[PDB]
């Protein structure tokens, strides 16, 4: 139940991706029933260790958001 044991860890992916046992909002394995709509197959089974993507390259605009407030550098000064 850990992707570092089975896959190769990328050392920078979030630890949310390390174990998929926390994805607890999915179905609780109620198969066989006749009244089972084919549209209930959307997220029918919980993703396991064998699904998790190998690497993750997010776009941090934390440097961008702390500068883009207000305006850029403008020379209203008296040189």
């Amino acid at each position: 139940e850990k992707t570092s044991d089975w896959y190769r860890v990328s050392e920078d992916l979030p630890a949310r991706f390390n174990n998929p046992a926390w994805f607890r909002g999915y179905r609780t394995k109620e198969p066989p029933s006749v009244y089972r709509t084919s549209n209930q197959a959307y997220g029918s089974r919980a993703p396991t260790v064998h699904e998790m993507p190998k690497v993750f390259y997010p776009n941090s605009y934390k440097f961008s958001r702390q500068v883009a407030v207000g305006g850029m550098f403008q020379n209203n000064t008296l040189n």
Partner: protein, 425 residues
């Protein structure tokens, strides 16, 4: 979305007596009105064909009309007949006599007001009504006469609501009513400008499919009512269950009525086996698609091979891919394209629902608009005019306020009706 059920006559009451059985067999309602908990997708849309009552109990929105209490002494005494609400039981004191004139003119007015009052009271208790529907008999007089009186009355104050009917049509081979062609050519004269959709039920078609295909040794009216109710519950399945391509009753008529005088259809229930052949048959899609073209399991008794299909719709119930639904249907388009109209490569609605009936993994039912309806209509018009030419059984109508101008205009647009099928052949 919801559809109310309304029935007039002995044949209408008897068909709906087991229709309410087969529609509660799917929703899981016992013959008192309580739920038997089986799935959440079994009552999430029960509003469509059922009304809430004082907790637990579910009352049908059914109104039952006849001029006699004879057929209502049996619809209440049936195994599932306690479910109805008694104020909707509207009945007269004197019977009609299998005649259109006495059931539409002289005793019609004493009962149409009471029926129109109770069908308005149920209609006002609605969130959003798609339309109405009727089951009645054309050969009789209570189902044909006052039945089409309610067709004309409801269309007056509900014009923009789709209204279909499931009527049994007079027999080709062996008659039941001696005056039945008089009743049909009067009724068909009225339903052709009013009902948005209608279904022909031949009795010999029911006997042909019960002898050749399902092979009952002694068929009775119970098994005939099973087959007509299955295809009438099956057409309207997408109203009350989810599906990856649905079709309610209103999407059907815009898809199969190309001309306003052209809405006479042909129903059929696909999976029908005997007790022997059930086992020697794999129940899947390719065995069900090309088998529906086979005229032996057809429920028409007037095959399309001496006619021409115009537009056909099949709604499929169960978990099946529609790759093979389309691939087998195009396989039964190109192999026999002469019997279809050649100017459309694919004149077929395919609709799907994900909830099948109990006991069958997948099921299907189809609705067909073909030319062979005119073979029924031409034969019933010559059956009508053979006895109309000699003034045979006519004074029983003229004694109740019926002249000859309405009869010579009932055959006139019937003759225009047989005329508007030859050019499309």
């Amino acid at each position: 979305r919801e559809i109310v059920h309304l029935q007039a006559g002995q044949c209408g009451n008897q068909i709906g007596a087991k229709f309410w059985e087969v529609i509660s067999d799917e929703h899981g309602i016992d013959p008192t009105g309580t739920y038997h908990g089986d799935s959440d997708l079994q009552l999430e849309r029960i509003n469509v064909y059922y009304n809430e009552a004082t907790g637990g109990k579910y009352v049908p929105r059914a109104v039952l009309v006849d001029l006699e209490p004879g057929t209502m002494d049996s619809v209440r005494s049936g195994p599932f007949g306690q479910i109805f609400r008694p104020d909707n039981f509207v009945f007269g004191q004197s019977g009609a006599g299998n005649n259109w004139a006495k059931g539409h003119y002289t005793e019609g007015a004493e009962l149409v007001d009471s029926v129109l009052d109770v069908v308005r009271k149920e209609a006002e208790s609605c969130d959003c009504l798609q339309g109405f529907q009727l089951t009645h008999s054309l050969g009789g007089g209570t189902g044909s006469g006052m039945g089409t009186l309610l067709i004309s009355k409801i269309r007056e104050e509900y014009p923009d609501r789709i209204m279909n009917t499931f009527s049994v049509v007079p027999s080709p081979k062996v008659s039941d009513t001696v005056v039945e062609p008089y009743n049909a050519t009067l009724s068909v004269h009225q339903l052709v400008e009013n009902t948005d959709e209608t279904y022909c039920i031949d009795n010999e078609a029911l006997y042909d499919i019960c002898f050749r295909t399902l092979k009952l040794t002694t068929p009775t009216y119970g098994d005939l009512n099973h087959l007509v109710s299955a295809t009438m519950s099956g057409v309207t399945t997408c109203l009350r269950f989810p599906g990856q391509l649905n079709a309610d009753l209103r999407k059907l008529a815009v898809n199969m009525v190309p001309f306003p005088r052209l809405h006479f259809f042909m129903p059929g229930f696909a999976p029908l086996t005997s007790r022997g052949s059930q086992q020697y048959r794999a129940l899947t899609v390719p065995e069900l698609t090309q088998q529906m073209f086979d005229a032996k399991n057809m429920m028409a008794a007037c095959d399309p091979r001496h006619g021409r299909y115009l537009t056909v719709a099949a709604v499929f119930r169960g978990r099946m891919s529609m790759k093979e639904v389309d691939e087998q249907m195009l396989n039964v388009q190109n192999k026999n394209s002469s019997y279809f109209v050649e100017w459309i490569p694919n004149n077929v609605k395919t609709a799907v629902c994900d909830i099948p009936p109990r006991g069958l993994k997948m099921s299907a039912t189809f609705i067909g608009n073909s030319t062979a309806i005119q073979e029924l209509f031409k034969r019933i018009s010559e059956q009508f005019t053979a006895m109309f030419r000699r003034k045979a059984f006519l004074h029983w109508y003229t004694g109740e306020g019926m002249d000859e101008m309405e009869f010579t205009e009932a055959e006139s647009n019937m003759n225009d009706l047989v005329s508007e099928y030859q050019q499309y052949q």
